[PDB]
Amino acid sequence: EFRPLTLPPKLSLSDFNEFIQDIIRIVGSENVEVISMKPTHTHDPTHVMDQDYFLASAIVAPRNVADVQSIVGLANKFSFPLWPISIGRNSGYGGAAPRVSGSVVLDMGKNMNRVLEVNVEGAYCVVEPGVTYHDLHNYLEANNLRDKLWLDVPDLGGGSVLGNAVERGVGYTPYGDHWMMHSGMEVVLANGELLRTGMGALPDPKRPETMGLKPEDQPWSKIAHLFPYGFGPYIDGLFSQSNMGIVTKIGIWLMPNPGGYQSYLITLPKDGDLKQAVDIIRPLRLGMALQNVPTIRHILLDAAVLGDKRSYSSRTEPLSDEELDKIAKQLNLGRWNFYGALYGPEPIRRVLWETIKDAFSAIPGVKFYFPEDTPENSVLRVRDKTMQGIPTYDELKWIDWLPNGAHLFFSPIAKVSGEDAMMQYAVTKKRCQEAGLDFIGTFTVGMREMHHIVCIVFNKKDLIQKRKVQWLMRTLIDDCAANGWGEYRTHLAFMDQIMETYNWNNSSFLRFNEVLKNAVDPNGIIAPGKSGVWPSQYSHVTWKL
Amino acid sequence: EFRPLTLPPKLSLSDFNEFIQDIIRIVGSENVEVISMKPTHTHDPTHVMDQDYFLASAIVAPRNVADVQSIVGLANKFSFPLWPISIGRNSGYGGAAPRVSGSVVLDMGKNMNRVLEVNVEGAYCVVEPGVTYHDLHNYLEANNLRDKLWLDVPDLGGGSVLGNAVERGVGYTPYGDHWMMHSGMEVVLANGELLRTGMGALPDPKRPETMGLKPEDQPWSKIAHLFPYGFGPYIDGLFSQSNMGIVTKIGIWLMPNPGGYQSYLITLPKDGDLKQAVDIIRPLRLGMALQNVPTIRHILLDAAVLGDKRSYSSRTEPLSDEELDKIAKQLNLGRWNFYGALYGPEPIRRVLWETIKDAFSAIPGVKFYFPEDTPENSVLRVRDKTMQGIPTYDELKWIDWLPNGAHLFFSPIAKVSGEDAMMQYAVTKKRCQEAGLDFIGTFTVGMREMHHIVCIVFNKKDLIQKRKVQWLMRTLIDDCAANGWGEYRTHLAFMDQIMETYNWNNSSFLRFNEVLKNAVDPNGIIAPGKSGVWPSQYSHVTWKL
Amino acid sequence: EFRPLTLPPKLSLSDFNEFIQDIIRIVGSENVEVISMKPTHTHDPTHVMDQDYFLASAIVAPRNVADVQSIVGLANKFSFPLWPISIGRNSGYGGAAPRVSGSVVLDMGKNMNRVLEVNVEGAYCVVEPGVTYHDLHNYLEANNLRDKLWLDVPDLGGGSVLGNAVERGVGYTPYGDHWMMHSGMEVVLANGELLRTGMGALPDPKRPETMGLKPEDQPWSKIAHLFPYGFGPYIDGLFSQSNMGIVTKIGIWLMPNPGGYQSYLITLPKDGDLKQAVDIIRPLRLGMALQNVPTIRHILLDAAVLGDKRSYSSRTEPLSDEELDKIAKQLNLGRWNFYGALYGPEPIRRVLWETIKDAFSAIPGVKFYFPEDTPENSVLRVRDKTMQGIPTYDELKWIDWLPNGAHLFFSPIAKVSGEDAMMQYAVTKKRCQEAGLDFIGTFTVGMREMHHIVCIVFNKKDLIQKRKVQWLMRTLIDDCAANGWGEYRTHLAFMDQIMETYNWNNSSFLRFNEVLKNAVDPNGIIAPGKSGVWPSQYSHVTWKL
């Protein structure tokens, strides 16, 4: 098609139509949309910034890897920026919106869907960008692999197994650190050239049945998904949260059924119980008593899962300390809520579980519950599935906290120290109040770190509050940096700020990144601006926010 | 000093004396050597290739990080290549020798020694290149941290904690994967600029007491050694086994005493027991019954530790199948020998230990022993310390298998499948006999892979045998590739061969690697040729072997 | 000379000795110093940062303008950075020290001394960098121009008339805005070429008596020192506080004796009288009742002039609110102290003076005094000379507040609003106490702004306090920016911080500045880093603080 709402930088409308005609001729009219459950891929859905911001010109859905190389060629030819997405369901990080309007959103999920391989002896799977978590789960069940191999899912299962992994997302099983569970990745660099990593570089020895296959369709050697390092420089991580390559295929390790599973819930009665709780979790996390990635939730998170905010109050301003206590009682929950699980044979679960309980019993009024012990609608019953690798749609209910809610995640990291966790909670809770927002969040326990997802929800049609939300977010970043904590991930608009945060020694780390980017992407057509990294033809003055 | 034996490429003697005077003027004459226990740093000690090869021109010991930047500057000024080393005790991988003669060996270890930090709450340590394993141990004990925090050592404790970690070395405790246990790394890139990665990029908030400190001496932010990723592209691995930067500091995670430890020995009687044993290890390793990295050793490895070859035979040719059997008996060992260990509270050790024995009992004549149950000189008593993070000097005894022995490691990776384990063993054993060399070796058990260190030992003054040793090596590489198995690490001379092995899709991995190298190192002064990666001013024709 | 302590970036010792020999051959050995009342020109005297920082390699005194061009040429030949100074008496702004060590301090003052012209009809003077304020005064008196023409001096008369003027210094007569009183400037750009601005570009018509004179020695056209603009782009300000050229000559307007002068002192009793006082000053300053730049001083400033801190207290920590009150009484001063002066015929002074008193009488306990009415040692008697263009050595007494005192100026600008004045005072006073430093300071009244010189004084041999002093400074900058107030000038180490403060629209002002710098100074030899502006061969990573 013809006249887009926004053309990518410096490109004429004639150039734009020449290009699109070319891509249409490659992937068919049914896979190239021009902008003149079902996630949008054309714009930031969790509106926070104004219009004209992060608006694609056209969404293109490659049929396969060839198509992605033809499309890269065309972007180099015409200097048309691309914005490669796998699924784009994470509104909160901006979903599928491109950072620089005019871009071509590359929907890799629509046709590049396959569960390429599920290896039981090696306990791994090889996946394309389209393979959501539900998909890999349905794949496992229709092949009876459910009782041999287990997944590891993020709070929502409609996300991409590889998209989430390359973005470094976390899960709640012993295999929760997703990016650390990859081995074998296939990438389409900016020059067009295909590249596979680690032992993906060591090629399967020739054999009659695999002769003549295009590179993209060739099998991988035996150790390709069993050892990640390969030999030499381990370049894999350049492709995480970066614009250095288009990730087309990835191997993810799978957890073999542990032959024993118990999920539990420990409720902490006071809002200041978080300090003792986190001091307790520390030694138990580092000492492997705490098997998976346990979560510490704030009462409104579980409150939200179960009901909107009018369902708990009429107040338009932020619920008070009293009201929060009251909601806790109502739900039989604590003010803070720990969710975890035990894996393996009963004799070992049992020792761990006595230890855990024992530890947490130094917190007055603590109360331990397994799923059965809680109401049918409870979060624990839902999270009992999440910690065993079973994906769900439940926990999405909280996005609706406010009427025309949208949300953004402010995500700092905090030591696994109560002192520190309380400090960061304070900081975020003050600002949230200052903005007139309920604080809503979780700490997910890392072995020596704690990912702190603050869920800022707000009215997507309210000019005043969105501006309040922007103030909040940018103030939180500074505040957090002032206290030496940075965010591990963000939405399109906060990328620059956040990368400006990592400025040790005069921005050394972003300087060095900008070289690697320009070297490998001389026309800078792969996602200019992702994570604050800009190719030289994108003046910082004109583009950073 | 004046006239070196080998000048670095294109450099005049005048230039060379200019430079040396400059460096002597920076770091003192007591630190800058000109080539006209105590490891050599001037040449490949495990001689294999001929002379002229891998011969430094001068060794230079920086006093600190400034000194490394000054030196980098002078390398960029004069176009003098540097070969940065930490310790260089790993003869076998060529130790300190530089890949291209004329290089300046940068001994970082001699002055950059400090155990910078040992954090108990976060359970990490931050170390300089000089900090050997024995060093971090002695540090621990003199601060009574020995019963709180535990190390993870490689078969020899004299190596560098960070050198080994950036080289992707492996250990025998649950934290055996060394490079996967780092978080926080400080680098001096080739441009001279300092860069710290991940959360090491988020700077510690100003405070009165740390003002005016050089970047090199600034503290790090709180999550710097607790979370590796930071934000954006996770560049860390570009500094593993590569020439992309000079590693100055690194944070390595430590293991919190587990409150329970049992090390053991299972002996496998026959030479073909390796196949069932490796099928047995598979599920227990993946299912976490097998806590640390367990090791399967071949009889001569343990034989070797205990005595030279003349001490078991007069034969100059390779010992026979019968003789090996006899040696096994003499030592009360198997033909193959599994070493592992149980960590934690007794109730849990016990269930795991019943599981392990149980499984291995399906191997005829299998015999299980704890340390106490074996002779005073036994390997198990030595490895009982190794699997608990206590480093030793013991296991070096085997390098002396032959009189003027030197050794080289042929290191393929193999699936954790007996089928595969035997296949690779076969291949390696043929060749070794074809060269008239005793096969000597180990498989170190990875969660889904097995590092297989073939120890080629030979007579460093024997022209004929060294050639035989070069034939062996190069033929094993090809053989191994033929059967789809790459090497994880190698010695200076096999670097090229080994990367050529990783040529999927027409050498994509190396091309893409040359791009990043040239970008960040236009003068190409950082270790040209490490891992097979060459900056553009070093003709491939002239330099690869 | 031979071996310097610090060589400028990338330069070999050989190169350095080549250059010095060349310069010694141009200006004589008596003028070119190699670093192996009387201000130092080799290093930052108000030590604050550590050593290695801001240390010149050699000081070079040009005999004249040719000599400055020869030297420029040699800097472009060898790529040696220069640090041009006039006098370098302003410790506090780092005096003569160069921003990047290894630089060549260009002392223009030592030989380029002349009062070139004192024109009475046009009421201007044309001066070289060496002409201090005392110098132009002594010139005036020896030519009896003292009752015809009047100077405008800064708190200390030993500074350079043009150095201070290009640095945008301020004075206390109606011609206090120094840089706004220049017209005619002669510059030696980095290419070596001489350029005079505005009407200094329109050349004096040839005439017999000025033929064959070097450009440097040519007279100027008639309107050269009467109208600043010329025609076209008014480039003059590119040479203020910048590294865009070496200023050799400048025309400064002089004030024609006004035939009437009364200087006075109004004392404000309370520490919060500053708010009403500044609201009072506002309208009178804008309405021209307030003739010169009036000053509001804090009690310790005047206290300081008169005596050290031990002379008022034993306390090592900062004097208290009560103590300050007591000192005020002892000296017959206020807590705050306004100094001004009336110019012209008595009938007009009188009406203004009734207006001033009248207004200030709305402040309880306000007391008005002329010089005569105050003690012999009083500050008013000292400043009575200052507001009439007579320079003095008096006011330097305060630098000795503490024993081995050094001082630094923290200089924010603030509106001429009491509200704002108090706000900024607050901010500054907290921090100063947090560092355990006596707040000492002045607001100098601008027509619509107020320059606020916080005098941080401290112990130059105290590591702990200097660090405290560095924390203070950097925290005040951020604080101040937080409240939208920039600094107008700073010391070498805060230059970067301070420009980063001016980052509207993603550092537009500095980017645009780097462009002009590089264009006119491709080798970047003119003062790299002054005001935060760096030529492209000086990595930001490596150089900013």
| Known catalytic membership, residue A467 | no
Between C9, C10, C467, which is nearest B211 by CB? C467
Q: Can you tell me which residue has the tokens 């990723």?
A: B229
For residue A508, the distance in angstroms to the closest alpha carbon of chain C comes to 6
> Which three-class secondary structure string do you get for B260-306?
CEEEEEEEECCCCHHHHHHHHHHHHHHCCCCCCCCEEEEHHHHHHHH
CA distances from B529 to B78, B109, B353, B471 (A): 19, 22, 47, 22
For residue B368, the distance in angstroms to the closest alpha carbon of chain A comes to 23
Q: What is the dihedral of CA A147, A90, B199, B62, to 10 degrees?
A: 80
Co-location of A129 and A278 in the same domain: no
Count of CB contacts below 8 A, A vs B?
321
Instruction: Tell me how far apart the terminal alpha carbons of chain B are, to the nearest angstrom.
Output: 31
Q: Using what technique was this structure determined?
A: X-ray
Between B21, B25, B212, which is nearest C50 by CB? B212
In a domain, B23, yes or no: yes
The residue range of the domain holding C286 is: 261-491
Count of CB contacts below 8 A, B vs C?
39
Co-location of C11 and C123 in the same domain: no
Across the interface, whether the CB atoms of A283 and B348 are under 8 A apart is answered no
Tokens representing B377?
Answer: 């000189």
Co-location of C252 and C268 in the same domain: no
CA distances from A11 to A14, A53, A421, B91 (A): 8, 17, 49, 58
Co-location of C297 and C426 in the same domain: yes
Q: Which residue of B has its CA nearest to A416?
A: B122
Between C506, C539, C540, which is nearest A544 by CB? C506
Phi, psi of B42 (to 5 degrees): -95, -20
Kind and range of the H or E element at B119? strand B115-119
Across the interface, whether the CB atoms of A511 and C543 are under 8 A apart is answered no
Between B199, B235, B486, which is nearest A202 by CB? B486
In a domain, B251, yes or no: yes
Half-sphere exposure (Cβ direction) of C366: Cα atoms closer than 13 Å:
19
Q: Contact at 8 Å (CB) between C456 and C304?
A: no
Residues 6+ apart with CB under 8 A from C229: C198, C199
Can you give the CATH number for the domain in which B131 is found? 3.30.465.10
Co-location of A281 and A404 in the same domain: yes
Residues of chain A contacting B482 with CB distance shorter than 8 Å: 205
Phi, psi of A20 (to 5 degrees): -55, -45
Tokens representing B513?
Answer: 């690697």
For residue B123, the distance in angstroms to the closest alpha carbon of chain A comes to 8
Q: Contact at 8 Å (CB) between C235 and C320?
A: no
Across the interface, whether the CB atoms of A420 and B221 are under 8 A apart is answered no
Distance CA C193, CA C245 (A): 10
Q: Which residue of A has its CA nearest to C478?
A: A482
For residue B215, the distance in angstroms to the closest alpha carbon of chain C comes to 10
Distance CA C69, CA C519 (A): 19
Across the interface, whether the CB atoms of B193 and C539 are under 8 A apart is answered yes
Can you give the CATH number for the domain in which C73 is found? 3.30.43.10
Which own/partner contact pairs does B140-146 have at CB distance under 8 Å and 24+ positions apart?
B143/B118, B145/B118, B145/B120
Residues of chain C contacting A544 with CB distance shorter than 8 Å: 506
Half-sphere exposure (Cβ direction) of B153: Cα atoms closer than 13 Å:
27
In a domain, B271, yes or no: yes
> Which three-class secondary structure string do you get for C363-398?
CCCCEEECHHHCCCCCHHHHHHHHCCCCCCCHHHHH
Across the interface, whether the CB atoms of C541 and B194 are under 8 A apart is answered yes
In a domain, A142, yes or no: no
The conformation of residue C223, written as its DSSP 8-state character, comes to G
Identity (one letter) of the amino acid at B55?
Answer: L
Tokens representing B444?
Answer: 């170190």
Tokens representing A261?
Answer: 């599973």
What is the three-class DSSP state of C324? helix
CA distances from C27 to C42, C196, C215 (A): 19, 24, 19
Q: Contact at 8 Å (CB) between B8 and B527?
A: no
Distance CA C106, CA C175 (A): 29
Q: Contact at 8 Å (CB) between B109 and B86?
A: yes
Across the interface, whether the CB atoms of B231 and A203 are under 8 A apart is answered no
Distance CA B349, CA B343 (A): 6
Phi, psi of C343 (to 5 degrees): -115, 140
Taking any CB pair shorter than 8 Å as contact, residues of chain B touching chain C are: 18, 21-22, 25, 69, 73, 77, 191-194, 206-212
Nearest to residue A90, comparing CAs of A133, A141, A149?
A133
Q: Which residue of A has its CA nearest to B518?
A: A519
Distance CA C125, CA C178 (A): 13
Residues 6+ apart with CB under 8 A from C318: C432, C433, C436, C437, C438, C439
In a domain, A209, yes or no: no
Across the interface, whether the CB atoms of B192 and C10 are under 8 A apart is answered no
Q: Which residue of A has its CA nearest to C500?
A: A506
Residue A67, Cβ neighbours under 10 Å: how many?
Answer: 21
A273-286 vs A346-360: helix crossing angle, rounded to 10: 150
Neighbours of chain B (3+ CB pairs under 8 A): A, C
Q: Which residue of C has its CA nearest to A496?
A: C506
Give the bridge partners for B526, in sequence order. Answer: B82
Residues 6+ apart with CB under 8 A from C255: C123, C149, C150, C151, C152, C173, C174, C175, C389
Half-sphere exposure (Cβ direction) of B412: Cα atoms closer than 13 Å:
32
Q: Can you tell me which residue has the tokens 């620089």?
A: A100
Q: Which residue of A has its CA nearest to B479?
A: A205
Residue A537, Cβ neighbours under 10 Å: how many?
Answer: 15
For residue C509, the distance in angstroms to the closest alpha carbon of chain A comes to 10
C430 class by beta-carbon count within 10 Å (0-12 exposed, 13-18 middle, 19+ buried): middle
Between B168, B490, B515, which is nearest A229 by CB? B168
In a domain, C280, yes or no: yes
Residues of chain A contacting B352 with CB distance shorter than 8 Å: 348
Across the interface, whether the CB atoms of A417 and B121 are under 8 A apart is answered yes
Distance CA B479, CA B486 (A): 10
| Known catalytic membership, residue A93 | yes
Co-location of B49 and B163 in the same domain: no
Across the interface, whether the CB atoms of B193 and C14 are under 8 A apart is answered no
When divided into structural domains, chain B yields a total of 4
Can you give the CATH number for the domain in which B411 is found? 3.40.462.10
Phi, psi of C496 (to 5 degrees): -55, -55
A64 class by beta-carbon count within 10 Å (0-12 exposed, 13-18 middle, 19+ buried): middle
Co-location of C301 and C379 in the same domain: yes
Can you give the CATH number for the domain in which A530 is found? 1.10.45.10
CA distances from A178 to A165, A214, A297, B13, B184 (A): 5, 29, 21, 54, 20
In a domain, C89, yes or no: yes
Tokens representing A212?
Answer: 């003549």
Co-location of A498 and A535 in the same domain: yes
Between C506, C542, C543, which is nearest A540 by CB? C506
Co-location of C502 and C535 in the same domain: yes
Q: Contact at 8 Å (CB) between A442 and A298?
A: yes
Q: Which of B257, B504, B530 to mutate to test the interface with A (most CBs of A within 10 A)?
A: B504
The conformation of residue A205, written as its DSSP 8-state character, comes to P
Co-location of C118 and C174 in the same domain: yes
Residues 6+ apart with CB under 8 A from A316: none
Across the interface, whether the CB atoms of B202 and A345 are under 8 A apart is answered no
The conformation of residue A105, written as its DSSP 8-state character, comes to E
Residues of chain C contacting A511 with CB distance shorter than 8 Å: 539-541
Strand locations in C50-107 (E): 58-60, 82-85, 104-107
Across the interface, whether the CB atoms of C539 and B192 are under 8 A apart is answered yes
Across the interface, whether the CB atoms of A540 and C511 are under 8 A apart is answered yes
**How would you label C76-93 residue by residue, b for 16+ Cβ within 10 Å and e otherwise?**
bebbbbbbbbbbbbbbbb
- Helix boundaries (H) for A292-451: 299-306, 321-331, 346-360, 379-386, 418-435
Q: Contact at 8 Å (CB) between B409 and B92?
A: yes
Co-location of B242 and B303 in the same domain: no
Co-location of C24 and C83 in the same domain: yes
Q: Contact at 8 Å (CB) between A389 and A150?
A: yes
Phi, psi of C94 (to 5 degrees): 85, 5
In a domain, C145, yes or no: no
Give the bridge partners for B126, in sequence order. Answer: B117, B251
